[PDB]
Amino acid sequence: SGAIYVGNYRVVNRHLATHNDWANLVWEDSSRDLLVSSTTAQGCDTIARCDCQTGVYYCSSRRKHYPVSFSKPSLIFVEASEYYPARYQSHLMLAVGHSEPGDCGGILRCQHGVVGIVSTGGNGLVGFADVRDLLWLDEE
Ligand SMILES: NC(=O)[C@H]1CCCN(C(=O)C2CCSCC2)C1
Ligand SMILES: [Zn+2]
Numbered sequence: 387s388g389a390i391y392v393g394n395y396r397v398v399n400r401h402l403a404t405h406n407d408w409a410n411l412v413w414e415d416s417s418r419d420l421l422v423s424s425t426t427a428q429g430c431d432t433i434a435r436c437d438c439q440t441g442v443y444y445c446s447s448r449r450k451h452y453p454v455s456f457s458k459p460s461l462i463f464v465e466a467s468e469y470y471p472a473r474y475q476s477h478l479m480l481a482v483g484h485s486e487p488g489d490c491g492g493i494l495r496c497q498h499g500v501v502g503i504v505s506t507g508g509n510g511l512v513g514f515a516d517v518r519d520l521l522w523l524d525e526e
Contacts, residue, residue: 387402387446387488387490387491388444388446388490388491388492388493388503388504389491389503390429390431390433390493390500390503390517391425391429391430391431392429392431392432392433392500392523392524393428393429393523393524393525393526394424394425394426394427394428394429394526395412395422395423395424395425395429395523396422396423396424396425396429397420397421397422397503397517397523398420398421398422398423398491398503399419399420399421399490399491399503399504399505399515400414400415400416400418400419400420400421401419401469401470401490402490402491403421403423406423407421407423408421408423410423410424410425411423411424412424416470417473417474417475417476418475418476418477418478418515419470419475419505419515420515420517422520422523431493431499431500432498432499432500433499433500433517433518433520433523433524434495434496434498434499434500434501434518435498435499435518435521435524436496436498436518438496438497438498438501439455439456439457439458440453440454440455440456440496441453441454441456441494441495441496441501442454442494442495442496443481443483443492443493443494443495443504443512443514444492444493444504445483445484445485445489445492445504445512446488446489446491446492447484447485447486447488447489448484452483452484454481454482454483454494454512455481455482456479456480456481456494456514457479457480457481458479459476459477459478459479459516459518459519460476460477460478460479461474461475461476461478462474462475462478462480462506462513464478464506464513465508475505475506475513475515477515477516477519478505478506478513478514478515478516479494479501479502479513479514479516480506480511480512480513480514481511481512481513481514482510482511482512483510483511483512484507484510484512485504485506485507485508485511485512485513486507486508487507489504489507489512490503490504490505490507491503491504492504494514500517501514501516501517501518502514502515502516502517502518503515503517
């Protein structure tokens, strides 16, 4: 589990969105596994607006932040899970690292801010949904 809190937005994995998220919906995209809801309180996270390909992510199943090198956002084939059939997920970046069921939502960050959140795992790989192109997260 996990979310990004920027401005008056909460960014979560679409597959983990709550009823309150859906009832206060700003934007959702199943192809990216992302959903953004509105919040009453202002958040403290800042979104990275950069071209970093190295950063650090939080892995809840290890209680640890790991440094990783990750691929550029791309259209990657993801196997069927209990949340989606086997399909192409867009704006996904892969790295070598631990990601098991429950790690979705952990933040990937660089020196500039938040880059994305854990969205896929298994096989010693971890995939992150990028958020750096969602410029509107920085404004009202
Ligand atoms: N964004 C997605 O399509 C993900 C939805 C949740 C399931 N998923 C995974 O990668 C898990 C990783 C741990 S082993 C089981 C498969 C894919
Ligand atoms: Zn950066």
